[PDB]
A paper describes a structure:
Herein, we have described and characterized the structure and catalytic mechanism of BiuH, a cysteine hydrolase that hydrolytically deaminates biuret during cyanuric acid catabolism by R. leguminosarum bv. viciae 3841. BiuH is structurally and mechanistically different from the ‘canonical’ AtzE from Pseudomonas sp. strain ADP, which fulfils the same physiological role; i.e., it liberates a nitrogen atom from the triazine ring and allows further degradation to make all three nitrogen atoms bioavailable. The protein is a tetramer (consistent with SEC); each monomer adopts a five-stranded parallel β-sheet which is surrounded by α-helices. Helices α2, α4 and α5 (residues 95–102, 178–186, and 202–213, respectively) make symmetric interactions to another protomer in the tetramer, forming a dimer, as part of the basis of the quaternary structure.
Depending on the structure and the chain, the loop containing residues 44–53 is at least somewhat disordered and has a higher B-factor than most of the rest of the protein. The average B factor for the chains where the loop is mobile (in more than one conformation) is about double that of the average B factor for both the whole of the protein chain and double what is seen for the same loop (44–53) in other chains where there is a single conformation.
Numbering used by the authors:
A (entry chain A), B (entry chain D), C (entry chain B): 8 to 237
D (entry chain C): 7 to 237
The structure:
């Protein structure tokens, strides 16, 4: 009994095996550091409106996926307080542009775990039973236990949201896709530091018959989402 | 002691530690399947001139990097002949599009190791002592020994070339960057299935003070390349 | 519809979900370099009879598992001909004890891929459709595509054989076990360079209620193996 | 040249004598109440706690000396997320069958669960600021963790292993590090196991084939030959 979501470039998931037990929502880096005033992204001068746009659409998707018993996953980009997991190059680039990782700012130490700006925003806050991944990189798989958690939960399908589209969401999508996870990007549930770059990251997914998976949007997903009993 | 390459958005590498012993050139997927007549990409109708453009610029970079004793790395996307490393979704999408992985075409079985179309093109062919990575995914790190080879060679700096810009080159850049490798993308030594997508993948690198490293071009690299002796 | 194999310290697999589609036999490093005259192990002076002992038991297990449609996996420890994947410490230790990796011997370059001594012995030779893993380390997961192949084949159960019990078989078991694979070591289908060490690697598995899985033997497995429904 | 060696078996460690505070780390593996304390995981399965407490004083001497000479210090804890999302079904089931269920309530709290009293590192070997702690869901410290990433960023080449248990957590971690090219030293008096025979055999496995996983030495030999920083 297969179920499909209207998507581009093909009906998602590819084989219609869409159930709450094999499908997860992943909300990527909806932190004050990426979309709040005083955080990492605001420091570099980027338009916070572009990364706040996805907040309400992700909320509708989260509420619907929570209600139908789907697996829910959240990620935070961040570093250990002693910065032992912070590559030297990553730190130096952040310092040069005036937004140094580990440096004090209005929301505390930029991109440091346990600091106010680093935490997930209240509107999209995790509840009990939802796995949070704390990652030192852009991709959620690198140096984390995400893949191990996904295997133990026997998850085959991943629906990606969050920020930024072209950096954190996209790297995570490519990692999942390479390892065989079947992925759906929701275009209205993500935003980037450059709007052209946001749209191009979406288009990259559609090439070669869906090279990294397929693309849809929050309304199309929620109107066709299956529950536990069919 | 330090050496820099003129790059955008900062002089590369970040700390000027640029030597033949800690720096590698990586040539990504310069295979007939990605830029030849009769292969995977030609099958899907994409403009072969966009992916052939980088051939001569890569050749000039390779000749200069070979001459100064730099580490040279090549990659081929491909699958085991029995297709045991081919995720079901990857295969199905390629079939829908009319360019099925493992299916017979003019250059043999599409994207299958040991087939004519799968091999690296003659102009950029590896010589003895240059490591070739055979990868089942878009990123060169996933399910390969690339990282292990890089650590044994004590390589810190990576200069990326090849195709496609927004798929194979970009995923590999994000993997390397996340693990702390300091990377340089040469914009004239890569090309993609959509030219807009090629330029946007280049621009994505430059954001946030060089989120995935820095960008330059073949001439700027070759004119400022150090040898072992100052 | 559960099936169990009589094993120590518990009936294997834990949950009785034992089928040809989710279970693989893994034959580890049955190469001339580990059990042949003139190879790596014979060079270090070890008793070849200890590592030849498992040949007939593995043959019976392989024939039965091949006949009932089970997944079959083989591994070879070895290095790229240019030795780019050979850590400096590994090489140096092999040279000190007179069995240098890459060095010429009676069966060719020790532990080098493509050389006679490196290949799997004739008695246990792979047939088409059986995945061979070429690994640069002791564990079959490190820097390989084993895990990726396992996931695409939806394999949950692994039955380990080969040499050496305490080095290559054991490392591979611990990697699989950590990632959640349910493993069975067949005690008569493995052997080591020290017989005490072989018996202790078997005992290590049984501790803490089966810390790495369970232990059984070739006869117990073959008489209780489930086949397909015709 | 400016090389330093530690007297070890079967060869002087490290192999190439490149032994400095900046490229060498001490790793203390799973010295948690759950592995060596009263009321924890290991005590639940009936094992002799004296075998796993033996290494406490030797590790203390090695830690004090390595802390004093500016060496990198690493600690690990085996454990699981409170919702048990990182706990394989087989691992859980085996722990339940032998009466020491992971996540189940006991005297020191939920067995092998992060944030619980029994799960934490014992007081005698407690981490100080600037020492990386790895929280791992498996026996090997590399699997599903950021250990390797931290090691690379710190440009660490040499690892000196201590902790428990010798044949399970220490040994798996050694094999992972060794495979990826790290040069490793096991200190035999700074580790202990649930079976003493198994502890001695895990030590012997290291020495085979000219040091298949590295070399073996002991706390006294290490501390008297440890190079310091140049003031
Ligand atoms: Cl200078
Ligand atoms: Cl104390």
């Amino acid at each position: 009994n297969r179920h499909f979501i209207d998507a581009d470039p093909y009906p998602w998931p590819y084989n219609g095996a869409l159930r709450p037990d094999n499908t997860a929502l992943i909300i990527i880096d909806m932190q004050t550091d990426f979309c709040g005033k005083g955080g990492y992204v605001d420091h570099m001068g980027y338009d916070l409106s572009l990364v706040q746009a996805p907040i309400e659409p992700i909320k509708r998707v989260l509420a619907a996926m929570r209600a139908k018993g789907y697996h829910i996953i959240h990620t935070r980009e961040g570093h250990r307080p002693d910065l032992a997991d912070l590559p030297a190059n990553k730190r130096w680039r952040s310092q040069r542009i005036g937004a140094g990782i580990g440096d004090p700012g209005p929301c505390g130490r930029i991109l440091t775990r346990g600091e106010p700006g680093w935490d997930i925003i209240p509107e999209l806050y995790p509840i009990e039973g939802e796995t949070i991944i704390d990652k030192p990189g852009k991709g959620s798989f690198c140096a984390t236990d995400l893949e191990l958690v996904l295997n133990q939960k026997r998850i085959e399908n991943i629906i990606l949201t969050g920020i930024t589209t072209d950096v954190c969401v996209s790297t995570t999508m490519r990692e999942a896709n390479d390892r065989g996870y079947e992925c759906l990007l929701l275009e209205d549930c993500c935003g980037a530091t450059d709007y052209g770059n946001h749209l191009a990251a979406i288009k990259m997914v559609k090439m070669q018959g869906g090279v990294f998976g397929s693309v849809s949007n929050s309304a199309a997903l929620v109107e066709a989402l299956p529950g536990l009993v069919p």
